[PDB]
Design an enzyme around this catalytic site. Structure first.
Site, short mmCIF file in Angstrom:
data_model
loop_
_atom_site.label_atom_id
_atom_site.label_comp_id
_atom_site.label_asym_id
_atom_site.label_seq_id
_atom_site.Cartn_x
_atom_site.Cartn_y
_atom_site.Cartn_z
CG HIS A 40 -0.26 0.40 2.49
ND1 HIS A 40 -0.64 1.49 3.23
CD2 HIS A 40 0.78 -0.17 3.15
CE1 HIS A 40 0.13 1.58 4.30
NE2 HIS A 40 1.00 0.59 4.27
CG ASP B 231 -4.26 5.13 -2.72
OD1 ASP B 231 -3.51 5.52 -1.79
OD2 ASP B 231 -5.49 5.34 -2.73
#
EC number: 2.3.1.61
Lengths: 211, 212, 215, 216, 216
Positions: free
Chosen positions: E187, E191
């Site tokens: 992450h 995104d």
């Protein structure tokens, strides 16, 4: 003048064991290299019922009029040969699942067929099984071989119309027998023993559930 | 089979008519006689009728003198199962009896057996033995002759099986009955007819009234 | 009894479909009366089936000799059929059973019955049997265990033909079936032999064509 | 518990088990089980015995990373540590020697251990020594979620709620009580193949308990 | 493993993929494919090519957070690390420049790598250096689960088993061969929306391969 013989019969619905042999027929042969058969289920149910009712396992000593209770249990299975029927012995069965029973049966049958079995394992045993179903028989009286106290007689499996839920259905059924001696086992105990074998074969999960 | 004389015969008796009578009249029976209705009385009365219609079965061989005794009174030893074991209480003079009296005497003898007041006098002298192993689910089996009498009727569990009536398949509740008889006094024809007559009396209780 | 103690008798049971026999009786009754002046029945089929099975299996025909402990062999088969008379039951023996058919078996049975009825049946026509068939089905019996008459070694117990529902081909139909019992002397005959003997009898009765086809 | 979610490098695998045979066997045998054994048949005996079966056939999962010596010790015994639900909270009683027990024996042990825990009698000897965990959060209606490896063990089986869901059997659509099961494993010892095979063995044992007798 | 779990805070997003189109194309083209290329068609090549296409469209996932410099490096080349079955154990050979080949060349590369790993001649030259790893669990019949990122990649694909499952197509229920797909991603770089879009692009390119040709 030694033994007075009497027999009780019952019927077993082989509609669940056939399903097991029909679904796990290739996986079992691939993992263990043996053919699945009805005989292991009946041997295991016989062991379960013998454990439940130890009086069937006992035996009367005619010499001293003493009842000997045997904690070990061994079914003396039978295999036919051209020279005459011979009865091997499966030893210490109360701790074997279907795989071990099947493998011991296969080994003993091969040894009987090739004639390398001597009297060392032919004598002894607490139970006997006379599978007369190889040659199609409806039902009959099996003889007690000495010095046992009872023998299970399994016969052929036939498709006959039975009524379940009030409706006529065709299921593979087998007539089972139990030749005991009234001198040691009463009729109630023999009936309960045969009914318990029938319950443990017609639904194998009873063995897992201890019912 | 060696020291038994063995030689049994089997038959099927349909219990549809008997269960219908129970379902119809059990409330009235409980209200009047304060008892319960079972199939035991039907079989005891059928055995009494069959013993009336041919007393040679009721006879006993006396090996001491090679003499067959044709006893006139009918005395049926109905076996009641208890956790202690199976006994043989005897019901006296079954010829002059009916369903209510038979049930009452069976219950009274069973109650005596429960508390163990069963004297020796009411434990022998029977001419016929009726052993019910059907309270435990069993298809059929071979019972044993009780000495000194020469026959025993053993009924088994009641199951529903498909049976042909008029050429059509219909599910009815049926029983298997057995009779082990000594061949030294009664031949096959006589014993087969005896079992057939018991079956006919149980199947249609009105033959008892019609005296067939 | 000494005979009971000496002989260890065991029983096995099976069932026979009396569908082909009854059909042949239905189609071949008038011709039987016209030709032989005699009526067809059930005993001839079972006698011939037992004869064929014994011819194929000589062990059941054989008897152990109690006097000398010898399994004496008999090349000849004589079935001892029990006939019914008002004065009781007698067991005449039909002789030289291998070399006749359904017609001669009926003739011999009729002659033996009419001799027993009129009381001229001697001792020569009474003993010497090798296998016995007990027709207990005339008096409506389901099944049971017969008794071997000495010195014979086995008995076939014929029972009553009852209309019973049985499944063949996956369908439930009503066929007239009969229960057969074989009480055999276990000292001589084994379980395999007894079961195969009963199966051969049942197969020959179910299909009479097996007898002439010699299976 | 934070020092395990990253040090053990857990991965979670999920499967669905068909609880048709188990419910059938309960409906058929519950009356007799209560009459004879004086207990009540349950879901957890089947899952514990299935876990014992899988740990028999696959002993690497039964092993534990011995961080002292980087050893992989293959235990000859299986120690199932069930999470027993109590009003006070969730505890972790253990069942010892699970190789040789029937369903009834596991039921008796679980019921006795729950009676011990609810009445505040649970000892440490009945709490320590686990080898595999069968934490059951399904009586709370959960669909599926990721459990956490119970130390020092190397895997955990998470059971969730049972819901009737449409499934495909032979190309047709039939509704049957279907169950979501999870396994969270230490990927340093257990490959993806080993963990997937572990879950398949557990699922096969639960779906058709006859496998345990048949020893397939 | 330890390092990957401890350092990267990998999150997993899931999706479901229709395989009916792939099954139909295999059923109609298997004989011709064998007769012409001497290879048997498989489900894997479509997934590799779809992943390469999605990496083409979204270059962020086709990039690595450089640990030393805390920077991003954009690779103009797509390399996929397909895990190949082997009795010794599954390994991770790498396909080079995946965007330049169709299904036919990916099939031959997979077959050659499997043959070479069967004989254990897997050199390290064609074994390390990928950009996006793909893991298959469909040969052991896993339902779904979270895969582990093979370092130093930024994401991974989690192909699982294919099961016939009742699904809703145009308001009615029919059984179609359906498969769960999972993507474990770092992450830090990718995104949530980028990961979901990447998985959706893979889903679209697998559900109908005509999107690949059409360049949608």
């Amino acid at each position: 003048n030694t033994c007075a013989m009497l027999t009780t019969f019952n019927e077993v619905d082989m509609s669940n064991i056939q399903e097991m042999r029909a679904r796990h027929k290739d996986a079992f042969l691939k993992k263990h290299n043996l053919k699945l058969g009805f005989m292991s289920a009946f041997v295991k149910a016989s062991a379960f019922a013998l454990q439940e009712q130890p009086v069937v396992n006992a035996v009367i000593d005619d010499a001293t009029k003493e009842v000997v209770y045997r904690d070990y249990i061994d079914i003396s299975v039978a295999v036919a040969t051209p020279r005459g029927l011979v009865v091997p012995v499966i030893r210490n069965v109360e701790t074997m699942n279907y795989a071990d029973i099947e493998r011991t049966i296969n080994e003993l049958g091969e040894k009987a067929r090739k004639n390398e079995l001597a009297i060392e394992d032919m004598d002894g045993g607490t139970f006997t099984i006379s599978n007369g179903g190889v040659f199609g028989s409806l039902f009959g009286t099996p003889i007690i071989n000495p010095p046992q106290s009872a023998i299970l007689g399994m016969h052929g499996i036939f498709d006959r119309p039975v009524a379940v839920g009030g409706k006529v259905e065709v299921r593979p059924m087998m007539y089972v027998a139990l030749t005991y001696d009234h001198r040691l086992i009463d009729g109630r105990e023999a009936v309960t023993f045969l009914r318990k074998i029938k319950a443990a074969v017609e639904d194998p999960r009873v063995l897992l559930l201890d019912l």
